[PDB]
Structures are given as structure tokens and as C-alpha cells.
Amino acid sequence: FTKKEWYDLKAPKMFLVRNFGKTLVTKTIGKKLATDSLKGRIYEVNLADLNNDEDQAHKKIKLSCDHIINRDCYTDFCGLSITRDKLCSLIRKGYTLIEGHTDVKTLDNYHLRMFCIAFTKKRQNQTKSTCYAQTSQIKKIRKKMVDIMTAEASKVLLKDLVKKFIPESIGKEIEKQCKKIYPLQNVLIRKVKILKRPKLDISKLMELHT
Amino acid sequence: HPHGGGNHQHIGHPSTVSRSAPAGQKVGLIAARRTGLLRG
Amino acid sequence: PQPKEGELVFGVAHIFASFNDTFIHVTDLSGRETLVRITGGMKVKADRDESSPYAAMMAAQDVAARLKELGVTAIHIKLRASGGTKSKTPGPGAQSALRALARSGLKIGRIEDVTPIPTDSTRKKSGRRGRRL
Amino acid sequence: PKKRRNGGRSKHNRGHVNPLRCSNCGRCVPKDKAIKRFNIRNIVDTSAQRDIKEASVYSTFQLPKLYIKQCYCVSCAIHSRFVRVRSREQRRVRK
RNA sequence: AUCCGACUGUUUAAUUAAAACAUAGCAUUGUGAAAAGCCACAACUGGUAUUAACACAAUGUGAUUUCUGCCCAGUGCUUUG
RNA sequence: GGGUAAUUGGCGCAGUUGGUUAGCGCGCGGGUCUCAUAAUCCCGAGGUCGUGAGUUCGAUCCUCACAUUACCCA
RNA sequence: AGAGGUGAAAUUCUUAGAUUUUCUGGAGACGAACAACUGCGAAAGCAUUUGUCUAAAAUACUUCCAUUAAUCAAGAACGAAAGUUAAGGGAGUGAAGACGAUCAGAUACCGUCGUAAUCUUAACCAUAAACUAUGCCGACUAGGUGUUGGAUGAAAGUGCUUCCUUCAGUACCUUAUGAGAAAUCAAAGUCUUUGGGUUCU
Ligand SMILES: [Mg+2]
Ligand SMILES: [Mg+2]
Ligand SMILES: [Mg+2]
Ligand SMILES: [Mg+2]
Ligand SMILES: [Mg+2]
Ligand SMILES: [Mg+2]
Ligand SMILES: [Mg+2]
Ligand SMILES: [Mg+2]
Ligand SMILES: [Mg+2]
Ligand SMILES: [Mg+2]
Ligand SMILES: [Mg+2]
Ligand SMILES: [Mg+2]
Ligand SMILES: [Mg+2]
Ligand SMILES: [Mg+2]
Ligand SMILES: [Mg+2]
Ligand SMILES: [Mg+2]
Ligand SMILES: [Mg+2]
Ligand SMILES: [Mg+2]
Ligand SMILES: [Mg+2]
Known part of the structure; x- marks a missing residue:
């Protein structure tokens, strides 16, 4: 029955809004702490409402909360997706699609899969x-995609990788080096799955929320 | 034996006994959850 | 709750229409902590009409009433079409549910189709030669 | 008397083709014989479409589409009138 | 030519040597351990065990070939709180 | 012998919430429209296991049946 | 507080929490969309990624040998699905079987369950509308539009694309003083103007 409380959700400062909603929970009773029920929840947000621009209306973003000060959850990064209708609108009959995946480790010892996708182009005078x-x-194109993902992701760092996801630099770079084999149309990172996390360290996490 | 005797060589008794039966009596199928051909 | 001025409070409404019934289920935006579930089959008694537009409209009205009672003022929409190895198109109640929700008085956030398509295909019921009528 | 030159399907230089299942009635049909239809539908009709428009935030909203790609068997396809019965000369007319 | 048992094997020392018992093959049941399964002892302690599921223990049927239908209302055994 | 539950309309069930003491689905008879079937809306009837209260009731010992578990010196 | 399922309903699951939403782990099959009057193989057949092994064409050649060839009774290798033997595996589907419906009857068509089987390893069986219902090798005879893989010669590019030839594979259209009983056929034509070689019926 409804004797609940509301909390506030807060995104890391890599984004622009940093207040994206509220959630319910039952008041604590004996040995039910009302905070073990909160931590570990997963929230999916569109990234158009996290940055306030409608060109990025695809690319859903997944967030998980780890720390709770008195009435706030702090909700760091978990994964990506691509909004099925967008994917369905890209597949037309008379072309071919390339597709590949890889495993990679960041400098913070995270592990990820990446799942690129691509299509061919016209070179119109044909x-x-x-x-x-x-x-x-x-085969050659797929090998190039795997190599470029590995280099880019294993290079730097997690939050820098997330900043790299927003403007889709990996797609531009893959498209640029694959021109000599075959022209390619819109190239995307289709899905990122987080695979292992090193260990909770609330100092770093709260440094993400300044 | 509990099975012994008779004019036709049968058991005459349900052959599945319980886990609590005494030593001289636990003699057929012990605490059987199920009997017959297995089908999976 | 205790919202600030002119600020909307959001929830997620999972719609399920399956040629036999219509579910309208509203949760918070994490998935857990369900709020309302009126599911259409609590509005008629004919054991048919459970997928009719009328029952979906009645269920949506009940959901809007309860949601205003609780304090939620906006909704995200996820649409489902029962699509495993079964049918892929939604049933007759989805459109009526959406229209009743829109004209209820709430604000509509976003719409998405989440039908569980397989890349996989375990075998389908009613073996070859099909369902013969 | 061999009413069709291609035998009702488009297969050449092959032995076997894998089947698929009818979207309506569940029968097995080879992929080269089933009739295919691709649909780009709206979620709702136009009146409900405009009703969602002024119930919406963002002041510029577009409803998504649906992509289906259905497939049918001969019996289940011409009972629904996706395909009809033509004359001897009109049968040969592709496109 | 018919009946029984598949076969070599065993049995009522002193009235019954067989179609009776055993047997390979088939099937069912319990148990992951020194706080377990099955069994001995008045207690203290033991057997299987110098063991460990291709194992130990409790039952039916009885070589090969071809088969092994329907019934969980009754009586047993068993699962949940 | 002890404990628990239930008995209400043609059937099956709610009321055990004392200054209102009786209700609903299948029923039953008339319009509604039903290519000859169909969601159909108005109505009329239909009664509390049995005898007595500092009381206006379904509140009391007992007595008839039914089901379950348990008990036993003429 | 109902859920399933149907033309409409039963059988079936559920206040001991069903159906529904989120997260975590396991299991066995399958490989959508792209995907085509497209590719490979003697046929049966073959579709997620990467590595190794192993063959096969086609094209180019002022390389080597020099008739080593065509078709083949007997004989040999492969050979869908179902079915048989043994050990695994056992989610979904589901010959048998049990119910619930429809019907005059319904051992059926529809629905709820569900055994063998379907999958892997090691052995059998040798059959299909196993179909292009058209054996294999060679020559000649007509125009056009495509497409898959090489090579030659020429233009727009920001050592790549378009165009022109030619070889090999694969479709379609039109037409036949060519053929057929006709349907139709680029072979099913070059047949009373009847004989290029060869096996089977
Ligand atoms: Mg390639
Ligand atoms: Mg006997
Ligand atoms: Mg007897
Ligand atoms: Mg029909
Ligand atoms: Mg074939
Ligand atoms: Mg003998
Ligand atoms: Mg025998
Ligand atoms: Mg002897
Ligand atoms: Mg003697
Ligand atoms: Mg003697
Ligand atoms: Mg014997
Ligand atoms: Mg034996
Ligand atoms: Mg029984
Ligand atoms: Mg398993
Ligand atoms: Mg199974
Ligand atoms: Mg089934
Ligand atoms: Mg034959
Ligand atoms: Mg033939
Ligand atoms: Mg002649």
C-alpha cells in the first residue's frame, strides 16, 4: 500500500541536464533498509532529453545508480542502444551490409563489446x-573495423570514450579509412555492452558529479 | 523374507516402503519417489 | 510528491495488445515499482470483447484517473505486439488505448515499439500443412 | 499440361531451397515461392495522430513507423486477395 | 514330430535330480560422506572401506529374435506449507 | 464423548456491521434488434435448520441432519 | 484479480500470487532482416565470426608431352526424409495416447496436454513428383535486353570508377518458306530430301 517516498535522479556531468526524474520506494522497516532496493537499478534515457537537441533522438543511454546521499541517486554509465525504428529505416533491398564486433579493455580495466554496422554507397556515375x-x-572492411575499434577503445579511458560516443568519431574514422576498398554510407556504433567493472570507488564516482 | 511364501510366487504387498521402516522390513524399493519406465 | 513549479513528473506505460486482451501497465521510469494495471479484461463480461476498443478505452480512463490521484502528470509510451513466435502486429485495442490516453489530460512523452523479435526461431506451433480451417 | 514455364517459382541452377512459414496460417513454403510484402505503416490514424500532437512536449514531434515484412502461402495469400486469377495472356505480365 | 527349460552349472546325506535354484542380458529404487546410504552393538565403538556414482546398497524378470496396449477412482510410496 | 466449518429463492452464493433487517449471477414471463445466430437495456414474482431475553438484529442453552481430525475402566 | 484459447466456448493455470515489468545465472536447438527469375557442387545438398587443412573451376600464356580419346553390360563410390542398433542429449515441435468441443454420428478438420522421433557420436538401410517428368560427346543454323567471373583498348578521376571489344556461366523477350496431334519448343530445328558416335527403356 502507498506509504512511499520520492527521490531525485542525477546524471554525471558529461551530459547537460543532470536532473532527469524521480522514483518511488517504500519507507524502511525492520531490516529492510530502503537503500538496498535503490542501488543497482538501471534507467534508460533517450539522450535527446539528456542534452536537449533533437538530432540525437536515437541513441538511448543506460544509467545505473551506485551511491545515495540523503535523497539523491547518482547514476553512472552502463550502455547504449539505437532505437529499433532507426535501424529498420536503414536497410533497403539493393545493397549490402557489413557488421562486426570485438572485445576491448580500457585504462580503468573495464571490458566492452561494440557492434559496428555499415552499408555500401553509390559512386553515382555508375x-x-x-x-x-x-x-x-x-573481409577486409570487417578487419579494418575491428582494428579501429580496438585502437580507439584501448587507447584512453572510460569517460573519454563516452565523450567520444556522443559525436560518433569512430564511425567517421572507419568510413574514412575504408574508402579505398568500397564507398560506405552511414556507419554507426550500434550497441555497447559493459562486461566487467573493476570495483566501486565512491571518491571517483562523486568526482564525476563534482 | 517379507516376499516369501505363497502358492504362486508373487509379492502380494506394495513393494515400495518408507524411509522410517525398521531394519528387517526395508526390503523392496526404498523411499521411491516414482516407479516405472523413465521417459525423460 | 513535492514537484517544483510547472515541472512534470514522468512515468512509463507498457501497452500490450494481443488479439485476445489489452494490458495497460504503468510503472516508474526504472521498470520496478509498478503503479497501475487495468488490463482491459476487468471491464467486460462476455469473454470476448476483451480485445475490443471499448474495453481499452474504459481501462485507459481508469488509468488516467488513478494517475492523477497519485500525482503523475506525464507518460512515456512503449508498445508491444506479443511477437515471439506468435503474431507480429498489435491488436485492435492499441489505437483506442492511445487515443483515450491522449484525450485524458496527461502529457505524452515518447513512443516506441518494443516487440520481441527473434533472430533465432525456435520452431513454430501447428506443424507443417498449417492451421487448416 | 505445364501451365507455367517456371513451374510457379523462381529457381534455377540450384537443388534445394530452405523454407519459411506463412505469416497468417503457419504452413511451410520454400522461400523462392512465397509472395513477399513489405509494409511501412503508421501507429494510429490521422485524427489520433493530431490528437497526440498537441498532447506532446517538444513542440515538434513525429510519430514512428512500423516495419513488418510479411510472407504468405498461395492458399492463404489469394484468399485475402493480395493475388487474383488472371487470363492466359495476362499471366505472363510481370511488373 | 509335440510340451518345458535358452545353454555349461546347482539341490531335499537315508523314498522326489525336475519344468525347481542360479546364470549372462533387461529394467526400477536409494545415496556426494566421517552430521551421507545400507547393516551390527548393552554401552563404548564397528562392517561395506586398502571404498567414492564406469561406486556401494535394495528389488523384480530371466540367452538371441519381435514386442511390451488402457486405468492414479481403492491401498501403498512420495512433493509443497 | 471433544474441536472446527457450513445449512438463506427454481440452482449457486453474498449479508454474522442491533434505532434500514434482506441482496446478486444462472433461472422465470413482455418490448430491443438480431441475411434464420449475436455483446443488448428496461422491468414482475420468487426466501434466512426449530422453540424463549437486562433488546430494534443474524446475541443464548439445547436439537435435528453433513464433513474433518482426534478420545475410550460400568 | 483474473489469465489462456475460440466462429462462440470448454478442457487448463491462479490470493500457497497466475498473466504482466525489471535484473542475474544455466540449458539445448536455430542463424531473421540483407537475400535476388543471384553464387558453388556429380547428384543428394550448401548461409553468424576467425584459423588450419583440402580440392575445383574459369581467364592469361611464342611453357612441356604428342592421340594419351567418346560412350560404357559386369563391378565400385556417394545417396533427402522416414525407419533400425548403442551411448549421450532432451528447450521448442510433436505419428501414438488421453481429454474438451462441433455434428445425426466424428476413431477428423479446431483447442488443452503429451510418448517415440527430431540434435550429437559410431554403425545399418538405398528409397522420393530423387523433376528440366527432357541420357552423354561433337557440328551447323537469329535478332535484342540483362546479369555473375576474368582479360584487351579507350574517357570522366579528387593506377579507381564508366564505356567498347572478347572468353566462360546463367536468365528473359521477339520471330521463324523450321518442327509438332496440339499445348508449345533456340531445341522438342538441320527427318519418306529418313544413316556423326554411343548406353538404357
Ligand atoms: Mg566481401
Ligand atoms: Mg513366476
Ligand atoms: Mg490377488
Ligand atoms: Mg480453405
Ligand atoms: Mg529436389
Ligand atoms: Mg536346463
Ligand atoms: Mg525367453
Ligand atoms: Mg547339466
Ligand atoms: Mg532324498
Ligand atoms: Mg534319488
Ligand atoms: Mg527359473
Ligand atoms: Mg539379473
Ligand atoms: Mg493413488
Ligand atoms: Mg539441461
Ligand atoms: Mg521436452
Ligand atoms: Mg503443445
Ligand atoms: Mg525409383
Ligand atoms: Mg524419372
Ligand atoms: Mg521414313
């Missing part, structure tokens, strides 16, 4: 119905 590519070219 005047032919289709734009198919041979298998060997697909």
Missing part, C-alpha cells in the same frame, strides 16, 4: 541497379 560488394572486400 548507372547500375545494385551496389553489391565481393566477399573478399567485406
Whole structure:
């Protein structure tokens, strides 16, 4: 029955809003602490409402709370997704799609999968119905995607990687080095799954919220 | 034996006994959850 | 709760329409801590009409009343179409539920389709030669 | 008397083709014989579409579409009138 | 040519040597351990055990071939709180 | 012999909440529209296991049946 | 406080919390969209990523040998699904079987359950509308539009794309003083103007 309390959710300062809603919970009773029920929850937000710009209306973002001061949860980063309708709008008949995945470790000892996706282009002066590519070219392109993901992700750091996700630098870079094999259309990082986390350290976490 | 005797060689008794039966009596299928052919 | 001035409070409404019933389930924005569930089949008694637009409209009205009672003033929409190895299109009640929710008086946040498509395909019921009518 | 030159399907230089299942009635049909339809639908009709518009935040909202890609068997397809019965000369007319 | 038992094997010392018992093959049941399964002792302690699921213990049927249908209302055994 | 539960309309069930003491689905008879079936809305009837209270009731010992578990010196 | 399921309903699950939403771990099958009158293989067949092993074409060649070839009774290798033997595995689907419905009857079509089987390893079986219902090798005979893989020659590029030839594979359209009983056929034509070689019926 409803004798509950409301809390405030706060995003890390990598984004622009930093107040994206509230949540309920039952008041604590004997040996039910009302704070073990809060921590570990996962929240999915669109990133258009986290940054206030409608061009980024795809790319849902997942957030998990780890620390609780008196009435606030602090909700650091967990993963990505791509909003199914956007993915469905990209697949037309007369082309070919390339796709690959990899495992990588950051400097903080996180582990991730990345799942890129790509499609071929026209090079318009061709005047032919289709734009198919041979298998060997697909193999070369996939190898390039895996190498570029590995370098970029294993290079720097977690929060810097997250800042890299927002403007989609990996896609531009992959597209640029794959031009000599075959022209490619819109290239995306389709999904990022967090695989292992080193250890909770609330000093760092609260340094993310200044 | 509990099975012994008779004019036709049968048991005459349910052959599944309980876990608490005494030593001279626990003789058939002990504390059987189930009997018959297994099908999975 | 204790909202600030002119600030909206959000929740998530999971809609399920399945050619036999219509679920309207509202939770907070984490998934846990459900708030209302009126599911359509509590509004008629014919054992059919559970998927009719009428029952969905009645259920949506009940949900809006309870949600205003609690203090929630906005809703995110997730739409489902019962799509495992079963049908992929939503049933006749989804449109009526959405329209009743829109005309209730709440504010509508966002709409998304979350039907569980498989890349996998365990085998489908009613083996070859199909369901013969 | 061989009413169709291709035998009702488009298969050449192959032995076997894997089947799929009818979206309506569940029957197995080879993929090269089933009729395919691709749909781009709206979630709601236009009146409800405009009703959602002024119930919305963001002042510039567009409803999403639905992508389906259904497939049917001959019996379950021409009972619904996606395909009809034509004359001897009109049968040969593709496109 | 028919009946029984598949076969080598065993049995009522002193009235019954068999179609009776055993047997390979088949199936069912319990148990992950020194606070376990099955059994001995008045107690203290032991057997399996110099063991460990391809193991130990408790029962049915009885080589091969071809098969092994329906019934959980009754009586047993068993699972949940 | 002891303990618990239940008995209300043609059937199945709610009322045991004393200054209102009786209710609902299947029923039953008339319009509604039903390519000959169908969600159908108005109504009329239908009664509390049995005898007595510092009381206006379903509050008291007992007595008839039914079910469950348990008990036993003429 | 109902859920499933149907033309409508039963059988079935659920206040001992069903259906529904979120997270965590395990298990076994499957490989959507892309995906085509497209590719490979003697046929049966073959579709997630990476590595190793192993063959096969086509194209280019002023490389080597020099008739080493075509088709083949007997004989040999492979051969879908179902089915049989043994050990695993056992989610979904589900011959048998049990119910609930419909019906004059319903051992059916519809629905709720559900055994074998379906999957892997090691052995059998040798059959399908195993179909292009068209054996294999060679020559000749007509125009066009595509497409898959090489090579040659030429233009727009910001050592790459378009165009022109030619070889190999694969479809379609039009037409036949060519053929058929016709449907139709680029072979099912070059057949009373009847004989290029060869196996099976
Ligand atoms: Mg490639
Ligand atoms: Mg006997
Ligand atoms: Mg008897
Ligand atoms: Mg029909
Ligand atoms: Mg075939
Ligand atoms: Mg003998
Ligand atoms: Mg025998
Ligand atoms: Mg002897
Ligand atoms: Mg003697
Ligand atoms: Mg003697
Ligand atoms: Mg014997
Ligand atoms: Mg034996
Ligand atoms: Mg019984
Ligand atoms: Mg398992
Ligand atoms: Mg199973
Ligand atoms: Mg089933
Ligand atoms: Mg044959
Ligand atoms: Mg033939
Ligand atoms: Mg002649």
C-alpha cells in the first residue's frame, strides 16, 4: 500500500541536464533498509532529453545508480542502444551490409563489446541497379573495423570514450579509412555492452558529479 | 523374507516402503519417489 | 510528491495488445515499482470483447484517473505486439488505448515499439500443412 | 499440361531451397515461392495522430513507423486477395 | 514330430535330480560422506572401506529374435506449507 | 464423548456491521434488434435448520441432519 | 484479480500470487532482416565470426608431352526424409495416447496436454513428383535486353570508377518458306530430301 517516498535522479556531468526524474520506494522497516532496493537499478534515457537537441533522438543511454546521499541517486554509465525504428529505416533491398564486433579493455580495466554496422554507397556515375560488394572486400572492411575499434577503445579511458560516443568519431574514422576498398554510407556504433567493472570507488564516482 | 511364501510366487504387498521402516522390513524399493519406465 | 513549479513528473506505460486482451501497465521510469494495471479484461463480461476498443478505452480512463490521484502528470509510451513466435502486429485495442490516453489530460512523452523479435526461431506451433480451417 | 514455364517459382541452377512459414496460417513454403510484402505503416490514424500532437512536449514531434515484412502461402495469400486469377495472356505480365 | 527349460552349472546325506535354484542380458529404487546410504552393538565403538556414482546398497524378470496396449477412482510410496 | 466449518429463492452464493433487517449471477414471463445466430437495456414474482431475553438484529442453552481430525475402566 | 484459447466456448493455470515489468545465472536447438527469375557442387545438398587443412573451376600464356580419346553390360563410390542398433542429449515441435468441443454420428478438420522421433557420436538401410517428368560427346543454323567471373583498348578521376571489344556461366523477350496431334519448343530445328558416335527403356 502507498506509504512511499520520492527521490531525485542525477546524471554525471558529461551530459547537460543532470536532473532527469524521480522514483518511488517504500519507507524502511525492520531490516529492510530502503537503500538496498535503490542501488543497482538501471534507467534508460533517450539522450535527446539528456542534452536537449533533437538530432540525437536515437541513441538511448543506460544509467545505473551506485551511491545515495540523503535523497539523491547518482547514476553512472552502463550502455547504449539505437532505437529499433532507426535501424529498420536503414536497410533497403539493393545493397549490402557489413557488421562486426570485438572485445576491448580500457585504462580503468573495464571490458566492452561494440557492434559496428555499415552499408555500401553509390559512386553515382555508375548507372547500375545494385551496389553489391565481393566477399573478399567485406573481409577486409570487417578487419579494418575491428582494428579501429580496438585502437580507439584501448587507447584512453572510460569517460573519454563516452565523450567520444556522443559525436560518433569512430564511425567517421572507419568510413574514412575504408574508402579505398568500397564507398560506405552511414556507419554507426550500434550497441555497447559493459562486461566487467573493476570495483566501486565512491571518491571517483562523486568526482564525476563534482 | 517379507516376499516369501505363497502358492504362486508373487509379492502380494506394495513393494515400495518408507524411509522410517525398521531394519528387517526395508526390503523392496526404498523411499521411491516414482516407479516405472523413465521417459525423460 | 513535492514537484517544483510547472515541472512534470514522468512515468512509463507498457501497452500490450494481443488479439485476445489489452494490458495497460504503468510503472516508474526504472521498470520496478509498478503503479497501475487495468488490463482491459476487468471491464467486460462476455469473454470476448476483451480485445475490443471499448474495453481499452474504459481501462485507459481508469488509468488516467488513478494517475492523477497519485500525482503523475506525464507518460512515456512503449508498445508491444506479443511477437515471439506468435503474431507480429498489435491488436485492435492499441489505437483506442492511445487515443483515450491522449484525450485524458496527461502529457505524452515518447513512443516506441518494443516487440520481441527473434533472430533465432525456435520452431513454430501447428506443424507443417498449417492451421487448416 | 505445364501451365507455367517456371513451374510457379523462381529457381534455377540450384537443388534445394530452405523454407519459411506463412505469416497468417503457419504452413511451410520454400522461400523462392512465397509472395513477399513489405509494409511501412503508421501507429494510429490521422485524427489520433493530431490528437497526440498537441498532447506532446517538444513542440515538434513525429510519430514512428512500423516495419513488418510479411510472407504468405498461395492458399492463404489469394484468399485475402493480395493475388487474383488472371487470363492466359495476362499471366505472363510481370511488373 | 509335440510340451518345458535358452545353454555349461546347482539341490531335499537315508523314498522326489525336475519344468525347481542360479546364470549372462533387461529394467526400477536409494545415496556426494566421517552430521551421507545400507547393516551390527548393552554401552563404548564397528562392517561395506586398502571404498567414492564406469561406486556401494535394495528389488523384480530371466540367452538371441519381435514386442511390451488402457486405468492414479481403492491401498501403498512420495512433493509443497 | 471433544474441536472446527457450513445449512438463506427454481440452482449457486453474498449479508454474522442491533434505532434500514434482506441482496446478486444462472433461472422465470413482455418490448430491443438480431441475411434464420449475436455483446443488448428496461422491468414482475420468487426466501434466512426449530422453540424463549437486562433488546430494534443474524446475541443464548439445547436439537435435528453433513464433513474433518482426534478420545475410550460400568 | 483474473489469465489462456475460440466462429462462440470448454478442457487448463491462479490470493500457497497466475498473466504482466525489471535484473542475474544455466540449458539445448536455430542463424531473421540483407537475400535476388543471384553464387558453388556429380547428384543428394550448401548461409553468424576467425584459423588450419583440402580440392575445383574459369581467364592469361611464342611453357612441356604428342592421340594419351567418346560412350560404357559386369563391378565400385556417394545417396533427402522416414525407419533400425548403442551411448549421450532432451528447450521448442510433436505419428501414438488421453481429454474438451462441433455434428445425426466424428476413431477428423479446431483447442488443452503429451510418448517415440527430431540434435550429437559410431554403425545399418538405398528409397522420393530423387523433376528440366527432357541420357552423354561433337557440328551447323537469329535478332535484342540483362546479369555473375576474368582479360584487351579507350574517357570522366579528387593506377579507381564508366564505356567498347572478347572468353566462360546463367536468365528473359521477339520471330521463324523450321518442327509438332496440339499445348508449345533456340531445341522438342538441320527427318519418306529418313544413316556423326554411343548406353538404357
Ligand atoms: Mg566481401
Ligand atoms: Mg513366476
Ligand atoms: Mg490377488
Ligand atoms: Mg480453405
Ligand atoms: Mg529436389
Ligand atoms: Mg536346463
Ligand atoms: Mg525367453
Ligand atoms: Mg547339466
Ligand atoms: Mg532324498
Ligand atoms: Mg534319488
Ligand atoms: Mg527359473
Ligand atoms: Mg539379473
Ligand atoms: Mg493413488
Ligand atoms: Mg539441461
Ligand atoms: Mg521436452
Ligand atoms: Mg503443445
Ligand atoms: Mg525409383
Ligand atoms: Mg524419372
Ligand atoms: Mg521414313
